[PDB]
Amino acid sequence: YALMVSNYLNWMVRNLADMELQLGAVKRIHGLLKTEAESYEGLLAPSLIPKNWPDQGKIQIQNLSVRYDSSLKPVLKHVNALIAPGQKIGICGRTGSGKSSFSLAFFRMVDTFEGHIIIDGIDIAKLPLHTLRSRLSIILQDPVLFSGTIRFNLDPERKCSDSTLWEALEIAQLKLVVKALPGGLDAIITEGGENFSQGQRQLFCLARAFVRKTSIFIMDEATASIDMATENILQKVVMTAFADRTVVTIAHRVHTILSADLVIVLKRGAILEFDKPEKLLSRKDSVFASFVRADK
Amino acid sequence: DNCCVQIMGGYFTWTPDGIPTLSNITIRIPRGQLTMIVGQVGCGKSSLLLAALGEMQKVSGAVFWSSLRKRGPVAYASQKPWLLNATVEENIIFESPFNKQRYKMVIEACSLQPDIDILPHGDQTQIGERGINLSGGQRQRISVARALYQHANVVFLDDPFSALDIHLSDHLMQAGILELLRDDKRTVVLVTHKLQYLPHADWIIAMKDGTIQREGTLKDFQRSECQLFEHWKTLMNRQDQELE
Ligand SMILES: Nc1ncnc2c1ncn2[C@@H]1O[C@H](COP(=O)(O)OP(=O)(O)OP(=O)(O)O)[C@@H](O)[C@H]1O
Ligand SMILES: Nc1ncnc2c1ncn2[C@@H]1O[C@H](COP(=O)(O)OP(=O)(O)O)[C@@H](O)[C@H]1O
């Protein structure tokens, strides 16, 4: 047994050493195991919401003001607005003026510390987060397409027919490329959509936004990457099949926010104008008129 | 002759077991002038620059590079921006000799001075993956600022006006390119969808489905392919004004 301890003392101390080394990994995992939640449970009882609550838009903006975290300055100041169920309001403004944080506040993503911005009777803070972000629809500026196939990237739940996917892609105008694509359907999109061009990725994620029938459909800068010709084609095919649906557009180009129902300009966290775009063009001293003037 | 790249008869593919993504290319890009390469979405615009950079393979054709042969140091900023986990200064300098004057000239070209002011340690903050996440227009302006600082004499640019407003695009249009870029006589190629700047173009090449259409000047496009000229007039909506 003296031969045994001479054999095994190095094994004892070395196995203790890399046991501590691998214990550091469990320490890091346990350090990330104690992160905060997001309170996915809503205040309202789930039977008390309708099956079809968003049948009207009827969005009031009742003294909303948002921050990102509690140590920060508020992103949006006191804003006051009201949205018709069928209308086609577009939003524009200078960069960094909270116009995407507006959309995050619509999804309870950015931190809401003020506001009674109830949409068609039900409150935003009271709603369950999964029911909220399941039955609304935001399209982003960055195409963030996952790996896998066409139908998987378009509908990962397999909750629709392929004719609906063909229709939502027809109103996305990709049928000429995906029909010439050798898969047709279920062709492989790589890990990040690098198989296609950048605006094609944007059109793919726009088509994925199109398959969700939600009646409330806010757009961020979703035409910021595509060309103006297919932007005009997509703009004249939207608000035709999407006539009843309320759109909230962050237009990267003013010449589609011109044809609108209302417009809000946003600078420094507050509403500057909230009216028809046509009379804002005929104010002759407005930020919208200088926006379209510096545009073209 | 100032022929920058005289690729003639080119035929470029992504898949070697596939169709050529670009068809016959015979572009004649001049040196020291701004040129806008314009097509629709997915018609070979970035694929042409990746072809001229040699990153895509060709089944035929012959690229004719020219120096002041082989391709020299050409600066480039892609559609998707790419960042280094370093300081913003090291991101823009990109292993160049430091010049405080020209780093200033590109920081007021790209107009990232309030953004470096809001940055919590200024010029020496770690950005990228191991670092603070940025908005995206910020990353775009960083990627074009490192293209500005490079002293390439031939610079390539993909669209910087994806994640910018009207003000930042015009400030990047008037200052920066054609102001910092042509007094130093730096050859610049720029693909864009914002057609309001092709007025400021010494050359334009059109493109459709991997095929280039006719190239030339804006008075040449007043003659050639008048369907495309009226399409660009109607799309820019300054249809009363004649584009030159
Ligand atoms: N990484 C890739 N792999 C395979 N095919 C590609 C790739 N990138 C582009 N293509 C093909 O080339 C065509 C043109 O894409 P390109 O590289 O020119 O980007 P782009 O058209 O300039 O980007 P966008 O128009 O979206 O701004 C696309 O229609 C696509 O079919
Ligand atoms: N993740 C974040 N954490 C903290 N602040 C942020 C975050 N994202 C954006 N901000 C700040 O909020 C402001 C609102 O801008 P944002 O809505 O992101 O851009 P835009 O107004 O162009 O849509 C920005 O100036 C930015 O500084």
Ligand SMILES: [Mg+2]
């Ligand atoms: Mg935004």
Ligand SMILES: [Mg+2]
């Ligand atoms: Mg591209």
